[PDB]
Amino acid sequence: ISVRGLAGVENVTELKKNFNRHLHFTLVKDRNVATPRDYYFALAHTVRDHLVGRWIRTQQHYYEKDPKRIYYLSLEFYMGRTLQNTMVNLALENACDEATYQLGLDMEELEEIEEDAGLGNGGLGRLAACFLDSMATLGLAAYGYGIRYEFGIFNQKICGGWQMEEADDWLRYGNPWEKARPEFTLPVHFYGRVEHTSQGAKWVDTQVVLAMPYDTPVPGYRNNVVNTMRLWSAKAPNDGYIQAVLDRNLAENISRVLYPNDNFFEGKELRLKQEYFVVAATLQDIIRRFKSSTNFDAFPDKVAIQLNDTHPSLAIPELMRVLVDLERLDWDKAWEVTVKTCAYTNHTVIPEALERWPVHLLETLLPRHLQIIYEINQRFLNRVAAAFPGDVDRLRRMSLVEEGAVKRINMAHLCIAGSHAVNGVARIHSEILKKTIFKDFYELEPHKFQNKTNGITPRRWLVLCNPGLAEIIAERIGEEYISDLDQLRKLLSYVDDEAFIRDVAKVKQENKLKFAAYLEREYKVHINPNSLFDVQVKRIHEYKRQLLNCLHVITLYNRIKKEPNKFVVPRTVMIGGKAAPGYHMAKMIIKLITAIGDVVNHDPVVGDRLRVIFLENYRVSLAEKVIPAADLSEQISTAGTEASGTGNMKFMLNGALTIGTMDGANVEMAEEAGEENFFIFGMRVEDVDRLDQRGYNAQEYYDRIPELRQIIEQLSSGFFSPKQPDLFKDIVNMLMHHDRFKVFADYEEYVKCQERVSALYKNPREWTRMVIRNIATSGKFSSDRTIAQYAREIWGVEPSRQRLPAP
Amino acid sequence: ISVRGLAGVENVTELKKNFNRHLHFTLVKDRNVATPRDYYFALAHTVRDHLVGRWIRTQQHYYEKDPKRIYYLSLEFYMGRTLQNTMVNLALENACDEATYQLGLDMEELEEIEEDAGLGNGGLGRLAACFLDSMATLGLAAYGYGIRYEFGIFNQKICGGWQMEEADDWLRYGNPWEKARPEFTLPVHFYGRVEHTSQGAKWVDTQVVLAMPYDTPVPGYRNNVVNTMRLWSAKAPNDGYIQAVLDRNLAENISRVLYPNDNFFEGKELRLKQEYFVVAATLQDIIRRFKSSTNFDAFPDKVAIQLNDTHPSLAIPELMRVLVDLERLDWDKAWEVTVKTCAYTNHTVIPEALERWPVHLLETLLPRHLQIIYEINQRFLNRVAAAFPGDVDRLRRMSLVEEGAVKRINMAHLCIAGSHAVNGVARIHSEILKKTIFKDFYELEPHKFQNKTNGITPRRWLVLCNPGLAEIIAERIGEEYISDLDQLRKLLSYVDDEAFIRDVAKVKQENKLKFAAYLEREYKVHINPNSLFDVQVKRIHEYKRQLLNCLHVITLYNRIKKEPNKFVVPRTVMIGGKAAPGYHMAKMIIKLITAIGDVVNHDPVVGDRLRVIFLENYRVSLAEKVIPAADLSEQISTAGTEASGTGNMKFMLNGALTIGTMDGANVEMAEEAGEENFFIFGMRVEDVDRLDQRGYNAQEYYDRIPELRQIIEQLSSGFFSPKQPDLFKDIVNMLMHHDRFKVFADYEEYVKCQERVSALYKNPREWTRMVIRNIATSGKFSSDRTIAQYAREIWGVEPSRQRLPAP
Numbered sequence A, B: 001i002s003v004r005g006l007a008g009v010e011n012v013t014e015l016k017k018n019f020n021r022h023l024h025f026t027l028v029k030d031r032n033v034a035t036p037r038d039y040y041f042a043l044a045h046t047v048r049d050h051l052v053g054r055w056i057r058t059q060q061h062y063y064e065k066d067p068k069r070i071y072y073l074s075l076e077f078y079m080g081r082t083l084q085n086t087m088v089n090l091a092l093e094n095a096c097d098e099a100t101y102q103l104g105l106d107m108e109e110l111e112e113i114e115e116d117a118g119l120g121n122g123g124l125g126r127l128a129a130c131f132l133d134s135m136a137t138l139g140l141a142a143y144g145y146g147i148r149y150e151f152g153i154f155n156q157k158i159c160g161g162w163q164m165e166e167a168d169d170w171l172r173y174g175n176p177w178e179k180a181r182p183e184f185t186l187p188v189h190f191y192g193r194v195e196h197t198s199q200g201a202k203w204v205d206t207q208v209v210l211a212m213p214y215d216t217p218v219p220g221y222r223n224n225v226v227n228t229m230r231l232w233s234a235k236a237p238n239d240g241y242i243q244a245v246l247d248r249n250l251a252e253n254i255s256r257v258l259y260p261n262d263n264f265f266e267g268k269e270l271r272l273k274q275e276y277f278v279v280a281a282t283l284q285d286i287i288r289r290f291k292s293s294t295n296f297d298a299f300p301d302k303v304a305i306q307l308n309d310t311h312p313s314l315a316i317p318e319l320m321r322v323l324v325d326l327e328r329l330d331w332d333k334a335w336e337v338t339v340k341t342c343a344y345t346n347h348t349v350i351p352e353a354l355e356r357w358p359v360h361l362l363e364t365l366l367p368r369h370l371q372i373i374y375e376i377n378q379r380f381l382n383r384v385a386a387a388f389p390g391d392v393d394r395l396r397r398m399s400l401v402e403e404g405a406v407k408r409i410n411m412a413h414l415c416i417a418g419s420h421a422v423n424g425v426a427r428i429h430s431e432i433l434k435k436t437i438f439k440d441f442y443e444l445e446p447h448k449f450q451n452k453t454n455g456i457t458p459r460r461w462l463v464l465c466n467p468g469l470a471e472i473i474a475e476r477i478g479e480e481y482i483s484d485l486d487q488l489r490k491l492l493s494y495v496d497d498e499a500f501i502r503d504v505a506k507v508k509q510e511n512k513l514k515f516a517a518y519l520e521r522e523y524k525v526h527i528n529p530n531s532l533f534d535v536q537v538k539r540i541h542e543y544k545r546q547l548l549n550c551l552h553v554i555t556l557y558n559r560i561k562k563e564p565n566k567f568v569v570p571r572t573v574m575i576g577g578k579a580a581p582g583y584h585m586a587k588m589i590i591k592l593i594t595a596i597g598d599v600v601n602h603d604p605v606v607g608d609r610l611r612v613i614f615l616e617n618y619r620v621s622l623a624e625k626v627i628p629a630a631d632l633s634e635q636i637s638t639a640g641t642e643a644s645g646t647g648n649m650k651f652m653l654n655g656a657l658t659i660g661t662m663d664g665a666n667v668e669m670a671e672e673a674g675e676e677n678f679f680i681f682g683m684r685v686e687d688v689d690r691l692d693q694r695g696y697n698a699q700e701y702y703d704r705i706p707e708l709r710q711i712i713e714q715l716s717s718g719f720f721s722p723k724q725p726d727l728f729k730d731i732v733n734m735l736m737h738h739d740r741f742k743v744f745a746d747y748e749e750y751v752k753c754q755e756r757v758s759a760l761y762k763n764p765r766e767w768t769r770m771v772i773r774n775i776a777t778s779g780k781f782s783s784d785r786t787i788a789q790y791a792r793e794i795w796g797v798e799p800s801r802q803r804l805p806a807p
């Protein structure tokens, strides 16, 4: 049926009986009242049972061997569903498929019942999830530490073409994958004041909040390793009577909901609390575990802490506090230890996203940390002054403390000073960090800066979501590639294979028919599966330029209306993604997209030649559906703005061709497959700079491109908003007078490049041959490679593909 | 080892393997890291497994047979622990005892780890719990419906002699006995307004709160019947963004905490919400189940709703609303149905406890219900006027609407008008209801009023907490008495048995040594196990007169100090109980008790002759410990104030002699054992009335009793509060000028009667012979008898002791 593992007779028999056991004793049901949901739970519990043995031995192994431990701190872990992923990594997929079949059930139907663990916004959260999977697969003693939000990323509903946010109550029916561990609850302190007494400072009169951990297993791919992801939950201590207990919820609000802010840094107190909460509980856990393994000289040899962005940056001053205040280590010794164990990863260069906490906030909530931060700053600036004597301006630029309206702490500067390694997430992004944003720091300590180009896990993003494609590949080169993606290169020798070409093209057509069906089943819309599937799915941001895509779509529509009887390659263009609740422009763009579809999708002259569809509630489980069905992947951010991107890598691995700018990882992807096999266009980072020196004037482009001018006039006159003629004045206004992302500047080259895409699509054989060359060269983008580099170049540990001594 | 069931070889083997299974797969632990708590959980899960089969068939049986269903509505269910009770009713106690032994564990030690399900204040809540056990044992298709508070009755801590309230976070480590059933969540409405349109009224614009049920099994005694207790949990519907989700907690606060108010009716909105919440969700569930079994003519033949006090009284107007508004039945037909299915139980005659809801509250929160209540009142008063023409005063006295300062709805009058049966909980209490409080209603419909004297379950209150006593009894008369307590009478023929007398006396001494030890182990205090154990345990109330007990204790102390070298029967007097947080006087009494102990317990002249101990955090699990170890049970409420009492019955069944007034069930207890075998004293209900006509003047008693005057002067001068001389001025002030409970009036007779108790205690043989006569005549007070009467005289169903077709 596929290489989803063997379906042993004894194995299938055992599975079936355990399914019935759980249905009875665990769910307390019987075949006569069980709903599909109960069936899903019976299966989840049966599968989950196979993890227990491995989980216990893995943790036991690490105890005996005592290897260096990797702690990945993130406020986000975009996990998605875990039933199928668990079956895959355990080689249980076919056995469970058979067993449920014999029990008279459809496994695929049951899998659709599981809720997505949406504890992330997008790329950054999903990277942590892919990293966890790779770390387990490479046998690293790694622990993912975060917050267990009871409400993850909101569920997106489109009402009248507008986005509506709805609470994502993912724990409503329970989470069978987690294991509450109240025996390990730890106390976290807030507020209070600092007392300076004879022997050291003392943080007193603090308000206490408890951190209760919940452990979720993270299985490696067929190696019997099961690592742990520990998520903290806020609990009030039990020490008007009614009001007093009702007010417990104020302390527990800390882990209540994931902040959905993608673009702008707000600076809310609840978020700072969430950040200290995960940091404070995690460090106690880390040190406790270390004390078991007091000379902290060996701390860095046994501990590695990776900070996913600046969100968990308080780990630096908190490690110092514990080491200096509680362990009584001298400052210098404590600082040496801290720097050697901490490493920081940056994910963007846009200023509005940078965390710059008001000093008055830190002063009230974490008084001792502010004192430590000031001391760190003092000593750091003393180092700078000694290296660049008299460079008074460098001193103010490099300070962790920013003066002005209100004093703030630049968390990024804090992270650089307190880490032995700082990395970008794509070659071009890492270069930009050295050349611009962190130039001063790079000059001071060049050795700290590195690059670790992002990657995605081939298990979830190939084997799991595209079994058909994974099968035909395995049919030719074997299975070894699933944990060694570079082997995909061997597929180059089949680029002229008439059989393979036919197969590659066949799985894509099956994937498109499957998606086209799902679109009607759960959303009733109907699309032509013979058209080119043009998709752009990712969070809505101005820098991602969904607007540029919109301009092209309107252009295509305008050309058809001009020459109705001229042939054009049919296209179904799908755009999907969530907008941060307070991001007005982003919400206005979602409205534009739906407004375009209302005109285009109901124009009789257009027929089934052009369809504009907005994919509702884009999330991990939906991505697993659309991506394998896409023909064209849109990665069109303004050069220099997308640090890396990862959706781009997911499309490449699944047989879609890419049209994009030389931004983020796009650069390395084109470099791997060859620019001839990529649809590159638009300004490069340098062209953007040149335009900036000159001054970007959108009017110029409006005046010289008739097709563009016509589009803008359609928007202004209410062509796409009859009842509300001026509905889109904000978008037009932005495009013409304050477009930081130069949408117009790339319009002409984008449209022309899109014409070349349509031309190639007209030649099935050649389109597929180009696809084969993309899939065959996507090996570099596996997160196994990324993690192997982090392991070797930052953490100081050697990855191992050695199977663990059976379960 | 005892008749705790057989310990079969196969049974013990199976238990052990399932214990290890759960420890591994359920707890995800291994013998090397498991804590006693894990062991308890492994056992709880193993035992719980045996309930599943029976639970499913029982519910299945009721579906096929379709018997009349009994719904017991209560806002309280004081369950206590359920591990041992489950083993007992399933005859698994010895088998589990053996199995854990072989696994190298002490079952008794593990049992002590389980938390008490304290979802009740005292008597009323515990009665619901005993009733559930009896209903299952008598094979009635009964369902207990209530609220799943996440915080039950507060844990009592004594600080400096003062009570401190601490949140009872009983779900912290989880509840293995419940089963969440989200597939049955129901919506409950609040606020809104009423719209009168063409065809009927309509409740619109309501705020919605969801009710998620949690089911807990209730096993009958060895009959394989497992009924259900369904507890509702408040959940907000998922339909600033952050603030919006953080504000979900306002809806979920409904099921957050149990109101600890024992004595005074506050009238808080949160409590009214809790009351409508349980009523609204329960009725939907009831009607849904009925529709499966539309002529509601047969509704009363298939449904019986028992209201535990007036707390769930909104069930009456809510049944009407549904029937009239939704089902469209005519009023009269709907009213006939409602009255025939509802029955009300009263638990007190004190005015301050009566629920009288302000009309403005009902107007805002439940507008339609207020309209229905006014209509019910109108028609009822029309009935009264027709029966007693011209009795204009009777009309105002009987109205459900009370005029005055603020209009209120008398929920008790509502319950009488809408129920076909109203009952008191003890013969004397039920008589008082007819003669006083509900005289007007009794005259209107004499047939409605009944009596159902309370009872306790012999499984929990004998077999479970006193296995030693249960064993020696079974040794002579068999085991049949455990579900037929009347058989205890057969013990009368052993009253002269030298062996039995020795045995009865022996188990009591073992129980006292066990308790004396526990007192030192968990509370470090040390008491003489040879002294008479004088105990008064129950909630602190002025009417219960813990103060009268205090006066006696001080008197004993004063007599010893007067004649130090005179012999006196040594006594350890223990007083325990929780005070409602806002009950100042009650908290002042707790302070007095501890203050007395501070003087008495450290006076060298007193030695081990007198010990005053305040039992901290009295609760169900503690009662199971003290009661079997008591010699003297104090039931001294002012005649006519304690509706029934149940702690009194627990002491009688466990070999303690009773000293009390002719109040509540005390009357029937003395009547059953013979007044010669009871220590009765003080005023009878009539004497209290006479005193009231005359006028109670405490000064009179103060002036004529020197011993009493001396005690009051000691309190006033600061003898018991050196540092704060006037600490107890409020108590003295109350005693002298506003004692509604005439403490002084019963002082002399109480002290004399206590002398007779001491005299008998000096004669071991005769004391024990009297004990045998009490235990032998306690059969009437089993809740099996009570339930059989409710079943037959109110619900219309026949109890059955028939075993259900195996598991």
Ligand SMILES: O=C(NC(=O)c1ccccc1)N[C@@H]1O[C@H](CO)[C@@H](O)[C@H](O)[C@H]1O
Residues within 6 Å of the ligand: A048, A049, A051, A052, A176, A177, A178, A179, A180, A216, A217, B025, B026, B027, B028, B041, B173, B174, B175, B176
């Ligand atoms: O929540 C879990 N999770 C797991 O057992 C588990 C096992 C393997 C992998 C992931 C989760 N278990 C739960 O632990 C509580 C407390 O011990 C039990 O009462 C409950 O019945 C059980 O399902």
Ligand SMILES: O=C(NC(=O)c1ccccc1)N[C@@H]1O[C@H](CO)[C@@H](O)[C@H](O)[C@H]1O
Residues within 6 Å of the ligand: A121, A122, A123, A124, A125, A127, A261, A262, A263, A347, A348, A353, A425, A454, A642, A643, A644, A645, A646, A664
């Ligand atoms: O997703 C984010 N950032 C956030 O989601 C975020 C969350 C909270 C606050 C600010 C930003 N960054 C993204 O991280 C991925 C993985 O490195 C990159 O490939 C991508 O280019 C970048 O934009």
Ligand SMILES: O=C(NC(=O)c1ccccc1)N[C@@H]1O[C@H](CO)[C@@H](O)[C@H](O)[C@H]1O
Residues within 6 Å of the ligand: A025, A026, A027, A028, A041, A173, A174, A175, A176, B048, B049, B051, B052, B176, B177, B178, B179, B180, B216, B217
């Ligand atoms: O909470 C219970 N309770 C019982 O199974 C039970 C069984 C018999 C008697 C009392 C409770 N079961 C729980 O039900 C959830 C949802 O199905 C599972 O995920 C969890 O593992 C299981 O322990």
Ligand SMILES: O=C(NC(=O)c1ccccc1)N[C@@H]1O[C@H](CO)[C@@H](O)[C@H](O)[C@H]1O
Residues within 6 Å of the ligand: B121, B122, B123, B124, B125, B127, B261, B262, B263, B347, B348, B353, B425, B454, B642, B643, B644, B645, B646, B664
């Ligand atoms: O316990 C209560 N009442 C409360 O706990 C209570 C709770 C909330 C509000 C008012 C009273 N009443 C008690 O109920 C038992 C059982 O019928 C009687 O034996 C006892 O005499 C009576 O006082």
Ligand SMILES: *Cc1c(COP(=O)(O)O)cnc(C)c1O
Residues within 6 Å of the ligand: A121, A122, A123, A126, A537, A538, A539, A618, A619, A620, A623, A644, A645, A646, A647, A648, A650
């Ligand atoms: C991969 C992924 C992302 C990241 O997409 P980019 O195009 O890199 O922004 C965001 N959301 C989901 C659900 C993903 O699967």
Ligand SMILES: *Cc1c(COP(=O)(O)O)cnc(C)c1O
Residues within 6 Å of the ligand: B121, B122, B123, B126, B537, B538, B539, B618, B619, B620, B623, B644, B645, B646, B647, B648, B650
């Ligand atoms: C039996 C019981 C009660 C009732 O006691 P009374 O003496 O009738 O007031 C109260 N609390 C607990 C814990 C009980 O077990």
